Amino acid sequence: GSQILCVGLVVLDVISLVDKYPKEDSEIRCLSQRWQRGGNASNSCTVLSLLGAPCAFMGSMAPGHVADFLVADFRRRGVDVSQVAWQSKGDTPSSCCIINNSNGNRTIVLHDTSLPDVSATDFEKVDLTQFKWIHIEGRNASEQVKMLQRIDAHNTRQPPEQKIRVSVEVEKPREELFQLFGYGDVVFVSKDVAKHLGFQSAEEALRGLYGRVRKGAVLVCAWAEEGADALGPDGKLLHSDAFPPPRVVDTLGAGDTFNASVIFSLSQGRSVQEALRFGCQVAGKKCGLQGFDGIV
Amino acid sequence: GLVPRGSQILCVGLVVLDVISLVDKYPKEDSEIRCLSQRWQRGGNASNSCTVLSLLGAPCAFMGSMAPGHVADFLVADFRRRGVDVSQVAWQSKGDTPSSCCIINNSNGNRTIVLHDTSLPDVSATDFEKVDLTQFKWIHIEGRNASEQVKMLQRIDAHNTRQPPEQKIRVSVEVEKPREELFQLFGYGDVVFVSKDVAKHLGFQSAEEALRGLYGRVRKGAVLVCAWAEEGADALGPDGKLLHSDAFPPGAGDTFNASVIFSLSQGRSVQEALRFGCQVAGKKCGLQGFD
Numbered sequence: 001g002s003q004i005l006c007v008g009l010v011v012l013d014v015i016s017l018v019d020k021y022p023k024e025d026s027e028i029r030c031l032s033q034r035w036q037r038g039g040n041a042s043n044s045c046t047v048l049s050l051l052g053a054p055c056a057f058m059g060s061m062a063p064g065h066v067a068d069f070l071v072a073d074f075r076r077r078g079v080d081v082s083q084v085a086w087q088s089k090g091d092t093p094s095s096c097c098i099i100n101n102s103n104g105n106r107t108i109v110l111h112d113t114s115l116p117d118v119s120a121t122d123f124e125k126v127d128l129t130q131f132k133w134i135h136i137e138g139r140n141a142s143e144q145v146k147m148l149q150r151i152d153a154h155n156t157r158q159p160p161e162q163k164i165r166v167s168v169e170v171e172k173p174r175e176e177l178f179q180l181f182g183y184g185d186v187v188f189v190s191k192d193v194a195k196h197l198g199f200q201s202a203e204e205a206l207r208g209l210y211g212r213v214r215k216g217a218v219l220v221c222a223w224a225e226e227g228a229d230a231l232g233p234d235g236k237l238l239h240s241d242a243f244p245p246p247r248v249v250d251t252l253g254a255g256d257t258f259n260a261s262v263i264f265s266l267s268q269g270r271s272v273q274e275a276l277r278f279g280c281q282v283a284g285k286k287c288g289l290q291g292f293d294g295i296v
Numbered sequence: 297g298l299v300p301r302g303s304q305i306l307c308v309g310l311v312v313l314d315v316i317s318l319v320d321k322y323p324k325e326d327s328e329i330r331c332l333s334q335r336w337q338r339g340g341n342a343s344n345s346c347t348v349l350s351l352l353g354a355p356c357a358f359m360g361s362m363a364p365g366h367v368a369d370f371l372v373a374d375f376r377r378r379g380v381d382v383s384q385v386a387w388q389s390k391g392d393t394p395s396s397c398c399i400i401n402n403s404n405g406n407r408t409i410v411l412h413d414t415s416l417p418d419v420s421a422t423d424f425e426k427v428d429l430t431q432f433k434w435i436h437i438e439g440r441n442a443s444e445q446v447k448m449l450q451r452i453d454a455h456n457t458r459q460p461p462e463q464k465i466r467v468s469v470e471v472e473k474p475r476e477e478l479f480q481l482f483g484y485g486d487v488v489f490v491s492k493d494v495a496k497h498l499g500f501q502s503a504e505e506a507l508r509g510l511y512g513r514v515r516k517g518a519v520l521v522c523a524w525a526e527e528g529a530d531a532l533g534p535d536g537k538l539l540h541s542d543a544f545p546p547g548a549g550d551t552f553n554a555s556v557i558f559s560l561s562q563g564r565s566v567q568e569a570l571r572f573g574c575q576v577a578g579k580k581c582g583l584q585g586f587d
């Protein structure tokens with residue numbers, strides 16, 4: 001098993017770069033424009049790829065010129081798309097992204113297109129033998145849990161040296177998702193989810209939510225410019241300072257870059273401290289750049 | 297393919313891709329939200345007029361700048377969806393094909409606009425030097441880069457000099473932005489459209505004010521035209537008689553300019569053209585798109 005698989009969304013991001021966020025009802029002129037292959041699982045694949053780890057994306061896509069663009073980009077990055085759950089109903093999602101060039105704040109107006117999510121069925125049709133690691137962007141709970149149990153099963157029939165590592169991201173404050181909290185060896189929970197659950201810091205969210213996780217799991221929580229924290233089975237809290245760049249110019253997919261990096265690091269044998277640290281280092285570098293290119 | 301001589305109406309100006317999102321409420325900086333709906337539309341003045349002229353049944357051509365890429369590809373396919381001849385486009389090796397982003401608030405109607413970047417070079421007098429003119433009966437110019445467009449109008453003038461009256465090319469000019477550089481364009485064209493927004497900025501409070509105030513700026517023999525929303529539209533020619541037409545309540549300005557051009561190009565009178573202009577732009581306003 002040599003590849004890392006990420007399961008979630010792909011999206012066409014239509015980006016405008018402005019030097020100040022527009023006031024309601026006003027009209028600004030943008031500095032520059034570009035398109036980008038977005039979506040969480042999609043972004044992660046880009047980062048894993050640029051870091052040298054063979055990987056594969058799996059999510060829904062409607063055939064057309066949009067998809068043509070996205071696939072071209074995938075392949076230009078060496079991301080295996082063979083596992084894509086093609087469709088006929090709905091369109092491929094897109095979004096308008098305003099990025100504030102004076103602090104890299106990014107505002108996203110998303111357009112979901114009814115596109116049916118990957119289902120337990122779809123996943124059942126996948127050859128788990130190719131994959132050292134599988135990461136799942138929490139969207140359709142019920143059905144995703146099903147996929148998770150399938151991987152455990154497969155694991156219960158393997159040497160502890162041939163099991164598939166599983167990470168899970170609960171990014172949205174949404175009750176259906178808290179079941180995911182859940183499975184996997186590594187669980188990512190967003191700052192946004194932690195506040196909405198009443199918590200006002202990472203160590204606090206970490207102490208509050210550790211109870212929900214599979215025995216032996218590592219819970220991970222990033223907190224933007226305050227760094228990231230983690231907490232595992234020994235009860236010892238781990239921390240890493242951020243690596244802010246001098247000028248923050250674009251934070252679109254900062255958290256995806258963080259997630260990808262921590263996975264990469266852990267999948268390469270490194271410790272949780274080290275992975276946490278590396279997570280912060282790559283995310284920091286991305287935020288000082290437009291897009292993904294220059295991080296390596 | 298073969299365009300028959302003196303058969304087409306040419307429009308020179310901007311094309312742009314508008315991404316249009318309808319939202320519950322204006323988003324706060326650094327949020328992520330779901331729009332109610334989202335739409336990609338071809339926009340720009342010369343671009344919209346072409347669409348209108350096609351639907352009216354005129355052969356017509358667009359001339360503007362684009363850059364190779366997926367935005368142009370959409371723009372080009374949409375141009376063709378509407379029967380527009382796209383073969384005089386000025387392709388550019390530098391810059392971005394214009395793209396604009398518009399947010400419309402469902403619970404208040406307000407429009408927030410992120411306007412396109414400035415990187416793409418406009419069409420130049422030398423770009424335009426390369427065009428063979430015998431194809432066009434009428435040419436219409438969206439005022440943008442004025443000093444360069446004046447050369448283009450001088451070229452058409454030269455062309456016309458050596459031609460029978462019945463193979464002269466009619467010329468119309470459109471000044472929609474309050475930008476001083478544009479006002480020199482008033483001096484060119486058989487027909488000059490001025491927008492309400494420009495008249496007001498010059499301090500005129502009505503079409504009739506605008507027409508009387510600015511007619512001294514047009515070449516001898518020209519007709520000056522100004523549409524004023526629900527107040528209808530006026531026109532003033534060489535004889536000094538103000539012509540008028542009321543609105544017909546149900547890109548309307550573009551639907552209006554294009555409709556007037558069509559009617560005059562079909563040989564109707566200015567009065568009949570104001571009227572026609574008013575009917576169509578009425579119909580457009582109670583419609584979604586140009587369909």
Ligand SMILES: CCc1nn(-c2ccccc2)c2cc(N3C[C@H]4CNC[C@H]4C3)ccc12
Nearest residue numbers: 224225227242244251254255258280283287
């Ligand atoms: C620890 C990883 C990381 N560093 N920086 C980081 C970036 C710049 C300076 C310092 C740290 C982040 C910023 C993020 N975002 C999410 C929000 C959406 N836009 C504004 C917020 C920033 C997310 C993760 C990280």
